[PDB]
Ligand binder design. Structure first.
Ligand SMILES: *[C@@H]1O[C@H](CO)[C@@H](O[C@@H]2O[C@H](CO)[C@@H](O[C@@H]3O[C@H](CO)[C@@H](O)[C@H](O)[C@H]3NC(C)=O)[C@H](O)[C@H]2NC(C)=O)[C@H](O)[C@H]1NC(C)=O
Ligand SMILES: *[C@@H]1O[C@H](CO)[C@@H](O[C@@H]2O[C@H](CO)[C@@H](O[C@@H]3O[C@H](CO)[C@@H](O)[C@H](O)[C@H]3NC(C)=O)[C@H](O)[C@H]2NC(C)=O)[C@H](O)[C@H]1NC(C)=O
Ligand SMILES: *[C@@H]1O[C@H](CO)[C@@H](O[C@@H]2O[C@H](CO)[C@@H](O[C@@H]3O[C@H](CO)[C@@H](O)[C@H](O)[C@H]3NC(C)=O)[C@H](O)[C@H]2NC(C)=O)[C@H](O)[C@H]1NC(C)=O
Ligand SMILES: *[C@@H]1O[C@H](CO)[C@@H](O[C@@H]2O[C@H](CO)[C@@H](O)[C@H](O)[C@H]2NC(C)=O)[C@H](O)[C@H]1NC(C)=O
Ligand SMILES: *[C@@H]1O[C@H](CO)[C@@H](O[C@@H]2O[C@H](CO)[C@@H](O)[C@H](O)[C@H]2NC(C)=O)[C@H](O)[C@H]1NC(C)=O
Ligand SMILES: *[C@@H]1O[C@H](CO)[C@@H](O[C@@H]2O[C@H](CO)[C@@H](O)[C@H](O)[C@H]2NC(C)=O)[C@H](O)[C@H]1NC(C)=O
Ligand SMILES: *[C@@H]1O[C@H](CO)[C@@H](O[C@@H]2O[C@H](CO)[C@@H](O)[C@H](O)[C@H]2NC(C)=O)[C@H](O)[C@H]1NC(C)=O
Ligand SMILES: *[C@@H]1O[C@H](CO)[C@@H](O[C@@H]2O[C@H](CO)[C@@H](O)[C@H](O)[C@H]2NC(C)=O)[C@H](O)[C@H]1NC(C)=O
Ligand SMILES: *[C@@H]1O[C@H](CO)[C@@H](O[C@@H]2O[C@H](CO)[C@@H](O)[C@H](O)[C@H]2NC(C)=O)[C@H](O)[C@H]1NC(C)=O
Ligand SMILES: *[C@@H]1O[C@H](CO)[C@@H](O)[C@H](O)[C@H]1NC(C)=O
Ligand SMILES: *[C@@H]1O[C@H](CO)[C@@H](O)[C@H](O)[C@H]1NC(C)=O
Ligand SMILES: [Zn+2]
Length: 902
């Protein structure tokens, strides 16, 4: 038999009841420059099955406990066995307490320890974060337990189902504020041994998972609101950020969001208070710690004076996402990491619902389609994809756990759950969801538990009828990878499904229990009129008159793309759809106007329609005012720009896009009153942003003029920037492009003195738009100077230069030549050679450029490629694919653009 301390999963012989944890960060280094934290903990646990060994998680902790690493006591009048020895097993991250006798079933024990670890700047466990206020480097102490890092802060049974209550105490400098999951018990008191420190105890948590604990010591201040029901709401940030009002939007939306979810979940917010904190350079983005959610600054803070509308959208949705978890994930927790998709998928879906409550005019629910659905289909339409579900017994190590957090989990998770809610109807979905939350509150679940509760709700009504059980249906979408293309022959109404792969030559080797057949919910509209709903059963082919048309009619499947699939038609039907969009576009829902474009380009890639059919699907856009369909086109064509923008194809492409976008440009010119005032709602602001971007980058003289006027204006009065934050990135870029070193030097100055990251980002990126070789090269010369360009921004800046058709050869030469600086930057901070390689080689699409990539690889003898080693092979393989796609497409595409550019 194997020794349990060499297994990655904990025994089930002992379960925790409750913990006391006292942590003390030392925010002053020890002289060799080491930061530490000290801790003391007691865990009370119950013996379920007799055992002579206590196995608990511990990671990078030194123990200073008197005697062995722990002291062990009986609770009440329980006797305790003597300890034989305590040992640390690093691989499985265990503290192992060998006893001289056995613990007894039904008895409770208390295990006490004293310990310390590094308070490292490593964003893991209890860690430090350094940042600037004026001339002073500030250091705060914060946490990130997700997923398996609670054990790095104190010894604990560190699996999500082993829930317990926690009594947290922080010992901290007396002028700093201490925060945790729960409110403080009362006022802090001086530490007797050194009154320069204070002691803050927090109220007992509810029964909860280790990965959701948080505790923070900082100088941060807050804005506050007390909801009607007494729930205290705070936004925490740097003193200067709070003073500038940058927390106000977050504060504005939080209350409405929490209220939405309490109703949505039919369950009261389970905590006395809600803290949200903006952390500078929090690389994890956001973390849903129960009652103390952490965010990176740019995710939580908003500056009205400098920030675009998309910045506002990012804030409200990120908040909605993390707050969703305060019920789904935190109150009811998935028993194991193999089910992470359900948790993350669920939040990734309802983030739109919660945000929609806060901003009900913005139509935010739509954004899941571009943002998650089409995003994840790009990777789920590969042979190298994977099922949402993973057997629990395959997910053991901290590395395997981390692999759970990917695109499939979040975005497909969101997509399939949204499909589910839609085919059940939302009211039914909510009833099952409430039932599930009430049944399992403060406990753990698998996805089968959710299915079971949804089934209960289905079985309790008569109106919604399904072709099979909730499980059986969802099994098709969760146990196998990928998704079907549904193809309709409208002459007969024959309808088929096959596993959709972008690469029509690809070999799938992952087998499916279902032979890649799905049970598919199919909505459809015929001549602008909703039809009866239809289910494709697990068959390759079927027939229904729902999908059979006359010659003047059209049909269109998957209304609003609720279903996780793409749709192809016979050419006649495609043409009727096209005719419709050409003559009265408003007959077809805006999301579907986008879909037509998204799907057909994917179908063209897969060789299932000709590419010209996809391009025909953009012809209607000259009368399209709305954001989404235009965004579908821009996303689908960016590859065409990337392949062709150095070729004869490019002039007719530009000309075609100029023709298409001119009327939209004109529309907004009037609507915005000569560009003085933005459109009202989000979608229209977005459409305007894209229209100006598209107009300018394609050389519409009117947009070019606008950019010069505004940038000249700004330059004549630097302190009063006349350019609305929504339009900044285009106007900066186009105007630098048009100009010389005057514009360039001016924007360089602004960059150097910018206080706000986002504005710095815009400037950095616009500077790459110059059409002077000498400026781009000089600029390249700065990117490795950490005085002029932050290191974490160097490869980004190089990529932006590479993106400039003129800066392509300059960047490539620069990367080649200074590659001999992996050995400055695999050592001194990561660097992401991987993203740099992809960026600078993205364009490569000929034999000659392939020969160059090869010849550059012949610098294998030493230096190698570091974290970009795999990227470089991807590059050579992507280039081969580009070579092949350009030979197949260049002629057909050139002539289509010539033909349609007037
Ligand atoms: C986990 O932390 C809890 C909070 O520190 C502990 O509970 C507290 O124990 C204290 C003493 O052990 C009690 O404080 C006072 O101490 C005096 C000492 O002279 C005692 O007489 C008193 O009982 C007590 N105060 C009063 C008003 O009587 C606290 O009563 C108590 N706090 C609580 C219960 O909220 C837990 O003991 C500790 N857990 C373990 C396993 O050690
Ligand atoms: C947890 O305990 C670890 C093992 O006891 C500590 O790791 C040791 O850190 C020492 C530095 O504190 C290093 O030893 C020497 O330190 C002296 C002065 O600090 C220096 O003169 C030497 O350069 C250094 N010796 C060497 C060979 O570098 C040890 O490197 C290191 N030992 C091991 C086995 O890793 C941790 O510091 C300690 N952590 C905490 C938070 O308490
Ligand atoms: C958090 O919510 C607050 C309350 O809803 C918002 O406060 C609103 O700020 C608006 C922008 O500053 C103000 O709108 C207009 O500002 C112009 C500029 O001077 C004035 O001419 C207008 O008179 C004024 N509004 C009106 C209706 O005349 C609002 O005054 C103000 N609304 C309220 C109710 O106080 C915050 O904007 C919001 N914070 C963020 C970051 O979104
Ligand atoms: C954490 O604090 C809580 C709340 O004070 C402690 O809960 C008490 O537990 C004791 C001993 O089990 C019971 O007698 C009390 O009735 C509990 N009080 C409440 C309000 O539940 C809990 O024991 C503490 N945890 C640890 C490990 O000491
Ligand atoms: C908390 O107290 C510490 C110690 O007095 C203050 O930290 C000093 O701040 C000054 C600037 O005012 C620096 O020049 C010192 O080097 C700091 N010392 C240390 C160890 O950081 C700190 O400013 C106080 N913070 C608050 C919010 O009151
Ligand atoms: C959970 O939902 C139930 C059902 O809507 C709520 O209870 C209903 O509340 C309405 C509101 O006036 C009453 O008229 C109904 O008679 C109630 N139905 C039942 C079965 O009691 C309940 O308020 C919700 N709970 C939470 C915490 O949101
Ligand atoms: C994981 O969650 C399950 C429920 O999904 C917990 O099992 C329940 O425990 C409660 C309260 O102690 C009992 O009332 C139920 O009868 C149990 N349901 C079961 C066993 O199916 C289980 O305790 C949780 N696991 C851990 C380690 O806490
Ligand atoms: C639509 O589907 C039907 C089958 O369900 C196809 O009709 C069959 O054609 C085969 C040709 O070998 C005949 O042997 C069968 O007897 C036909 N079944 C009938 C007529 O009911 C038809 O070809 C399909 N048409 C499409 C996909 O355009
Ligand atoms: C398709 O999505 C659109 C939104 O893009 C839905 O239109 C919404 O309809 C509801 C009910 O009338 C209204 O609350 C919203 O005002 C509508 N928004 C807009 C922008 O029109 C439409 O309901 C969806 N269609 C289907 C069949 O689900
Ligand atoms: C897939 O197997 C086929 C055999 O039909 C082979 O021709 C092809 O090269 C293989 N690999 C790819 C990526 O197409
Ligand atoms: C276009 O269709 C919409 C929705 O069916 C309708 O209300 C509108 O009258 C139509 N417009 C024209 C110009 O026919
Ligand atoms: Zn999440």
């Amino acid at each position: 038999q194997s020794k349990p301390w060499n297994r990655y999963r904990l025994p089930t012989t002992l379960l925790p009841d409750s913990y006391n944890v006292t942590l003390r960060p030392y925010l002053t280094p020890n002289a060799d420059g080491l930061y530490i934290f000290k801790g003391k903990s007691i865990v009370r646990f119950l013996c379920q099955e007799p055992t002579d060994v206590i196995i608990i998680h511990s990671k990078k902790l030194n123990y200073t406990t008197q005697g062995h690493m722990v002291v062990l006591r009986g609770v009440g009048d329980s006797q305790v066995p003597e300890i034989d020895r305590t040992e640390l097993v690093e691989l499985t991250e265990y503290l192992v307490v060998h006893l001289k006798g056995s613990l007894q079933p039904g008895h409770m024990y208390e295990m006490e320890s004293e310990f310390q670890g590094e308070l490292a700047d490593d964003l893991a466990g209890f860690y430090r974060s350094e940042y600037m206020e004026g001339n002073v480097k500030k250091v705060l102490a914060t946490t990130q337990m997700q997923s398996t890092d609670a054990r790095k802060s104190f010894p604990c049974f560190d699996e999500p189902a082993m829930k317990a209550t926690f009594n947290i105490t922080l010992i901290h400098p007396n002028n700093l504020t201490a925060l945790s999951n729960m409110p403080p018990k009362g006022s802090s008191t001086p530490l007797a041994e050194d009154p320069n420190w204070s002691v803050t105890e927090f109220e007992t948590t509810p029964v909860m998972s280790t990965y959701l604990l948080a505790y923070i010591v900082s100088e941060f201040q807050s804005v506050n609101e007390t909801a009607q029901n007494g729930v205290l709401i705070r936004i925490w940030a740097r003193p200067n950020a709070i003073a500038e009002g940058h927390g106000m939007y977050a504060l504005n939306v939080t209350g409405p969001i929490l209220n939405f979810f309490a109703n949505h979940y039919n369950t009261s917010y389970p905590l006395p208070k809600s803290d949200q904190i903006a952390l500078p350079d929090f690389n994890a983005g956001a973390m849903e710690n129960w009652g103390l959610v952490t965010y990176r600054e740019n995710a939580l803070l908003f500056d009205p004076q400098s920030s675009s509308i998309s910045n506002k959208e990012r804030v409200v949705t990120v908040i909605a996402h993390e707050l969703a978890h305060q019920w789904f994930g935190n109150l009811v927790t998935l028993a194991w990491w193999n089910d992470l998709w359900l948790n993350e998928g669920f939040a990734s879906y309802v983030e739109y619902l919660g945000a929609d409550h806060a901003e009900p005019t913005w139509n935010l629910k739509d954004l899941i389609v571009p943002g998650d659905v089409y995003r994840v289909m790009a990777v789920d339409a590969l042979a190298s994809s994977h099922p949402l579900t993973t057997p629990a017994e395959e997910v053991n190590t901290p590395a395997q756990i981390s692999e759970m957090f990917d695109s499939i989990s979040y975005s497909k998770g969101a997509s399939v759950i949204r499909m589910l809610s839609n085919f059940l109807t939302e009211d039914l979905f909510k009833e099952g969801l409430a039932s599930y939350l009430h049944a399992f509150a403060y406990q753990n679940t698998t996805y089968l538990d959710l299915w079971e509760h949804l089934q209960k709700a289905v079985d309790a009504q008569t109106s919604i009828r399904l072709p099979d059980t909730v499980r059986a249906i969802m099994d098709r979408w969760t146990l196998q990878m990928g998704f079907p293309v549904i193809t309709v022959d409208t002459k007969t109404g024959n309808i088929s499904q096959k596993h959709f792969l972008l690469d029509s030559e690809s070999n799938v080797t992952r087998s499916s229990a279902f032979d890649y057949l799905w049970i598919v919910p199919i909505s459809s509209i015929k001549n602008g009129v909703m039809q009866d709903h239809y289910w494709l059963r697990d068959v390759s082919q079927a027939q229904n008159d729902l999908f059979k048309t006359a010659s003047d009619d059209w049909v269109l499947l998957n209304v609003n793309v609720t279903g996780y699939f793409q749709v192809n038609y016979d050419e006649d039907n495609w043409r009727m759809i096209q005719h419709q969009l050409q003559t009265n576009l408003s007959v077809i829902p805006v999301i579907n106007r986008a879909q037509v474009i998204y799907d057909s380009f994917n179908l063209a890639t897969a060789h299932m329609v000709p590419v010209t059919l996809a391009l025909d699907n953009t012809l209607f856009l000259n009368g399209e005012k709305e954001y989404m369909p235009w965004q579908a086109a821009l996303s689908s064509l960016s590859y065409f720009s990337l392949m062709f923008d150095r070729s004869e194809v490019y002039g007719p492409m530009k000309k075609y896009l100029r023709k298409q976008v001119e009327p939209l440009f004109q529309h907004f010119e009037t609507l915005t009153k000569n560009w003085t005032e933005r459109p009202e709602n989000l979608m229209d602001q977005y459409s305007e942003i894209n229209a100006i971007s598209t107009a300018c980058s394609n050389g519409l003289p009117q947009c070019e003029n606008l950019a010069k006027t505004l940038f000249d204006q700004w330059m004549s009065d630097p302190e009063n920037n006349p350019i609305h934050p929504n339009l900044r990135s285009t106007i900066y870029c186009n105007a630098i492009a048009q100009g010389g070193q005057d514009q360039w030097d001016f924007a360089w100055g602004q960059l150097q003195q910018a206080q706000l990251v986002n504005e710095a980002d815009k400037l950095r990126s616009a500077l790459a738009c110059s059409n002077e070789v000498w400026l781009l090269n000089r600029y390249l010369g700065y990117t490795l100077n950490p005085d002029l360009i932050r290191k974490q921004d160097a490869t980004s800046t190089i990529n932006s230069i590479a993106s400039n058709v003129i800066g392509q050869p300059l960047a490539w030469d620069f990367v080649q030549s200074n590659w001999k600086k992996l050995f400055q930057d695999y050592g001194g901070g990561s660097f992401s050679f991987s993203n740099l390689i992809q960026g600078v080689t993205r364009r490569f699409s000929s034999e000659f450029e392939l020969q160059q990539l090869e010849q550059f690889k012949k610098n294998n003898m030493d230096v190698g490629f570091g974290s970009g080693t795999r990227a470089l092979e991807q590059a050579l393989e992507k280039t081969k694919a580009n070579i092949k796609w350009v030979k197949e497409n260049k002629e057909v595409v050139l002539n289509w653009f010539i033909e349609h550019s007037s």
